[PDB]
């Protein structure tokens, strides 16, 4: 089904998750995203030790972006939330992957 801002991250299909990984895992994109995600209190959702755990996934050939999205997706955050964060951290390519109309041009 076509993505909308309301789609939950936990419902994204394998294909889109893998492609998001291709855009976000390189060049510490996943770490920019991980640091940017806030709890409702405004506090960081992920501390340095959470981030180190995601980092260690490279190198068993695993994707930190996937782990991050799987974990964060347990909060019922949405494609809209993710696109806001991607625009904020200037990872425009995966933003356009998900919601091309939501991206500043």
UniProtKB/Swiss-Prot annotation:
The protein's name: Interleukin-1 receptor-associated kinase 4
Family statement drawn from the similarity comment of this UniProt entry: Belongs to the protein kinase superfamily. TKL Ser/Thr protein kinase family. Pelle subfamily.
Subcellular location: Cytoplasm
PTM comment, free text: Phosphorylated.
Subunit composition and interactions: Associates with MYD88 and IRAK2 to form a ternary complex called the Myddosome. Once phosphorylated, IRAK4 dissociates from the receptor complex and then associates with the TNF receptor-associated factor 6 (TRAF6), IRAK1, and PELI1; this intermediate complex is required for subsequent NF-kappa-B activation. Direct binding of SMAD6 to PELI1 prevents complex formation and hence negatively regulates IL1R-TLR signaling and eventually NF-kappa-B-mediated gene expression. Interacts with IL1RL1. Interacts (when phosphorylated) with IRAK1. May interact (when phosphorylated) with IRAK3.
Gene field: Irak4
Role noted for this protein: Serine/threonine-protein kinase that plays a critical role in initiating innate immune response against foreign pathogens. Involved in Toll-like receptor (TLR) and IL-1R signaling pathways. Is rapidly recruited by MYD88 to the receptor-signaling complex upon TLR activation to form the Myddosome together with IRAK2. Phosphorylates initially IRAK1, thus stimulating the kinase activity and intensive autophosphorylation of IRAK1. Phosphorylates E3 ubiquitin ligases Pellino proteins (PELI1, PELI2 and PELI3) to promote pellino-mediated polyubiquitination of IRAK1.
Death domain sequence ranges: 18-102
Organism of provenance: Mus musculus
Modification type N6-acetyllysine: residues: 32
Phenotype of gene-disrupted mutants: Mice are strongly altered in their responses to viral and bacterial challenges due to a severe impairment of interleukin-1 and Toll-like receptor signaling pathways. Malt1 and Irak4 double knockout suggests an additional role of Irak4 in B-cell antigen receptor (BCR) mediated signaling pathway, since the double mutant inhibits B-cell proliferation.
